[PDB]
Amino acid sequence: EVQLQQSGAELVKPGASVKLSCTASGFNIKDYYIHWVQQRTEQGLEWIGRIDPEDGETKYAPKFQDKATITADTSSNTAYLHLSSLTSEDTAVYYCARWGAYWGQGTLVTVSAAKTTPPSVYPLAPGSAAQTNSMVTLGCLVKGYFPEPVTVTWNSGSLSSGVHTFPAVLQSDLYTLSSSVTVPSSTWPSETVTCNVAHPASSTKVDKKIVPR
Amino acid sequence: ELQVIQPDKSVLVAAGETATLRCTATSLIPVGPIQWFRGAGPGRELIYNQKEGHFPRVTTVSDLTKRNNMDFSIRIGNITPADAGTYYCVKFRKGSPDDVEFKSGAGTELSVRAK
Amino acid sequence: QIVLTQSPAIMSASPGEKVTLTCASSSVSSSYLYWYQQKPGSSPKLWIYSTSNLASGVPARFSGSGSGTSYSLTISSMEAEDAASYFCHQWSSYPRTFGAGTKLELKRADAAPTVSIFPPSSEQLTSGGASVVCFLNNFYPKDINVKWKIDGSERQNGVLNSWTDQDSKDSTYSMSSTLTLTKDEYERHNSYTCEATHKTSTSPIVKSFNRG
């Protein structure tokens, strides 16, 4: 099967540079043009350029000419996207693509002078002796981290039905994220409900068991 | 000097069969991909492009990844009357701003017998 | 470069309703016109290629049409899994461009939000902060407005609001509102109220707790 695996999320200070990666499987990149696309929250999808890994020929949209440099390595079956003099307008998700239907999962690139901070996770519980209803809603508050992303799961991915993980919101160079889970009351007091928060930029994986009070 | 040769002026297949559009290049020079079109001129329809594009109905007769390959014949599966037309085997070269057409074959007329 | 204008940028359709998305081009395009479906958190998926051909796995209810400078995507019978963003794409003119996209939501029946309010946890209070969290889950339509009342008075700032996209299953929306105060400011008050205004109620939707 055809698949494109891109590198992890990147945090770059404004004016610096970064090189994103894209490794392919199920085919040889030498046989097809490898494209790069950016998507900003307010400007949609924009084609950056492509490379013919067979001869190294590169094309670029005139907008990204002096900004983007595309390279490829047929030996490792990998394509690269180098971005220079990154401004805050370059904060976007960057996609790798074999044109048509084959896309990578995307790479978040945040351009900001803010410092990296691990999150504080706080449990949200109704409390012991509280009125028992049919359902109970537990929560998890992830506060004061930078940058994106943060991975939140419940019971190591076992709980997925009634989970709502909300998008992060930036307030003074720090993000705040919350997640709720609704389970039957016949389970949570007797069964373990644990909030699994991961923040790769700080290498912090925290499990937060939801206890009543 | 490369030539693009389509040894079939015309072809007749039945609906539901496969259409084999034959094409051979006489040279590897210049370097560049091969593209198949239905019709010529500005509004021509892209049928195949060996480097980019989605063409799930098309399979190549030979392995185009081989460096010494000069067979650019393709097969279009599950032919319907709507696939009738003139198909051109076109060699492209590297140019500006994108790939530039180098030479085109004389064309192969595909006619279809309906069910 | 070619300008692909997709209007309207957001639209709504009920289940079983026929919906048509339009794509107008600043200059002529040919069979290089693709449609891409994208849902939040996933890569763009090729949906229609060469104007009218469905990609593999795309349900037969989809269809594409158009030529020249105007194209269209059509769903014969709207389904819940069809709720996504759809971008038209051209690559017959250099450089290849995309449209701004049309976000397509499913118009389900109205649903009142299920509201949960949480006082600041004991872990956060020992750090010096106090965040009151209010979940407003599984409501429709999306439009909602939340106010924070502290002992009968509205607290204007210090609030972080976040909304989820339309859920893939029940096609509802959810909202989280967090009011963050210093530990001192929080303890100077007894009752905290999460007040929401939503179409499903002609009165405000209130959820409160007393600090003791």
Side-chain angles (χ1 to χ4, degrees), chain A residues 2-41 43-88 90-210 212-213, chain B, chain C residues 2-209 211-212:
Chain A
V2 179
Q3 189 189 148
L4 301 172
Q5 306 174 26
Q6 290 178 252
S7 52
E10 296 287 341
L11 169 60
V12 188
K13 298 292 165 286
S17 299
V18 72
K19 163 178 279 189
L20 315 177
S21 176
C22 169
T23 310
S25 59
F27 75 104
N28 305 340
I29 66 173
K30 170 170 280 291
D31 305 317
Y32 303 92
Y33 296 162
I34 306 301
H35 307 252
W36 285 94
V37 185
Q38 84 161 5
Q39 183 171 32
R40 297 179 292 204
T41 316
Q43 279 110 334
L45 293 156
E46 284 187 275
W47 181 80
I48 297 177
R50 63 90 165 159
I51 180 168
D52 185 359
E54 193 178 4
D55 57 6
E57 181 201 36
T58 57
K59 298 306 170 61
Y60 302 100
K63 277 189 46 162
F64 307 94
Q65 179 259 1
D66 67 72
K67 210 107 187 200
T69 297
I70 301 180
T71 58
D73 190 6
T74 57
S75 66
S76 65
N77 213 38
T78 306
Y80 302 92
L81 169 70
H82 181 92
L83 308 169
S84 295
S85 301
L86 287 172
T87 185
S88 56
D90 305 320
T91 301
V93 176
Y94 291 85
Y95 286 105
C96 181
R98 186 196 127 179
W99 212 245
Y102 308 111
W103 291 63
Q105 83 279 10
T107 293
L108 180 66
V109 176
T110 312
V111 180
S112 179
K115 44 172 70 75
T116 305
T117 311
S120 307
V121 309
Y122 302 119
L124 307 174
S128 58
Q131 181 75 44
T132 307
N133 300 285
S134 176
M135 298 284 123
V136 62
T137 295
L138 316 167
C140 199
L141 183 62
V142 182
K143 192 170 194 53
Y145 71 90
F146 190 89
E148 285 272 72
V150 157
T151 288
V152 184
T153 56
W154 295 90
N155 289 16
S156 308
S158 303
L159 294 186
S160 76
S161 305
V163 174
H164 296 293
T165 296
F166 299 86
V169 178
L170 179 75
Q171 173 147 64
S172 296
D173 289 330
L174 289 180
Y175 288 99
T176 287
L177 177 145
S178 61
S179 173
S180 69
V181 56
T182 304
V183 306
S185 56
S186 55
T187 59
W188 167 60
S190 55
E191 286 184 277
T192 61
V193 176
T194 315
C195 174
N196 308 118
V197 173
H199 185 238
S202 64
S203 296
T204 51
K205 27 180 168 175
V206 175
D207 292 5
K208 202 59 181 180
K209 177 184 178 62
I210 308 302
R213 247 301 165 169
Chain B
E1 193 68 11
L2 172 158
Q3 292 190 31
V4 181
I5 297 181
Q6 302 184 227
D8 293 335
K9 297 174 173 168
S10 48
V11 149
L12 175 59
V13 296
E17 290 185 327
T18 303
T20 297
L21 307 172
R22 297 162 69 205
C23 172
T24 85
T26 61
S27 178
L28 304 172
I29 300 306
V31 306
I34 285 281
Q35 300 186 35
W36 278 90
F37 297 95
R38 173 162 63 164
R44 61 183 182 182
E45 169 188 2
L46 179 64
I47 295 301
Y48 182 75
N49 182 318
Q50 73 173 93
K51 290 292 185 174
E52 52 178 344
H54 194 245
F55 320 102
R57 299 184 63 198
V58 178
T59 173
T60 64
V61 169
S62 300
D63 187 1
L64 267 49
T65 71
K66 296 286 103 183
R67 191 195 305 101
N68 290 313
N69 173 77
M70 285 178 292
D71 178 27
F72 298 108
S73 311
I74 58 170
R75 301 197 224 268
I76 306 177
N78 268 78
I79 290 299
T80 67
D83 295 298
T86 308
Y87 290 78
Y88 297 89
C89 186
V90 183
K91 178 56 148 63
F92 276 73
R93 67 157 174 88
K94 301 314 186 69
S96 186
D98 207 350
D99 301 336
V100 174
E101 166 170 344
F102 182 74
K103 280 191 181 179
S104 172
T108 294
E109 174 69 27
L110 175 62
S111 57
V112 187
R113 173 167 299 160
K115 301 189 178 73
Chain C
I2 308 293
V3 178
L4 299 180
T5 301
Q6 290 182 247
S7 193
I10 170 71
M11 71 167 66
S12 180
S14 307
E17 173 183 348
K18 163 170 173 171
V19 46
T20 292
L21 279 62
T22 68
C23 180
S25 307
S26 58
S27 302
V28 184
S29 308
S30 44
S31 78
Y32 302 66
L33 190 114
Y34 293 1
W35 288 88
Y36 283 88
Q37 178 196 80
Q38 188 179 33
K39 301 185 178 181
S42 301
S43 308
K45 272 194 262 62
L46 180 61
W47 216 246
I48 300 181
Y49 73 97
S50 182
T51 300
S52 40
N53 301 98
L54 303 184
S56 186
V58 176
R61 77 191 82 108
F62 286 88
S63 59
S65 173
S67 66
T69 59
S70 61
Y71 296 82
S72 70
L73 181 149
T74 295
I75 311 176
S76 60
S77 181
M78 166 70 63
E79 306 284 348
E81 65 176 10
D82 298 333
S85 299
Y86 295 84
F87 304 86
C88 55
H89 165 69
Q90 67 87 19
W91 62 291
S92 56
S93 188
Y94 191 96
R96 65 196 72 195
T97 49
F98 294 84
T102 290
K103 202 168 202 309
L104 182 49
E105 76 150 341
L106 178 123
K107 184 157 181 291
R108 61 153 293 153
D110 289 348
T114 300
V115 183
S116 310
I117 185 170
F118 294 93
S121 66
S122 189
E123 288 86 335
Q124 186 187 19
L125 286 174
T126 60
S127 300
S131 297
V132 193
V133 175
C134 180
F135 293 120
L136 308 92
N137 292 334
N138 298 92
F139 59 89
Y140 187 85
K142 176 157 199 293
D143 321 280
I144 192 177
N145 192 254
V146 174
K147 296 186 179 183
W148 278 100
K149 303 297 175 58
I150 303 180
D151 273 306
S153 183
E154 176 178 6
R155 183 48 195 263
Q156 181 62 31
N157 52 20
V159 177
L160 288 193
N161 294 328
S162 183
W163 303 261
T164 60
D165 290 287
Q166 190 171 35
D167 189 290
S168 292
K169 294 183 78 282
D170 53 11
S171 307
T172 61
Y173 298 94
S174 291
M175 182 185 178
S176 170
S177 185
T178 303
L179 171 61
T180 74
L181 302 164
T182 81
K183 180 207 170 210
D184 292 334
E185 298 168 354
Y186 167 76
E187 293 182 337
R188 310 205 308 248
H189 285 103
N190 287 267
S191 55
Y192 288 79
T193 295
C194 177
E195 190 192 81
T197 42
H198 188 252
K199 175 185 178 182
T200 54
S201 178
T202 57
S203 74
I205 304 171
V206 297
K207 199 78 167 190
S208 306
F209 71 91
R211 209 188 63 87

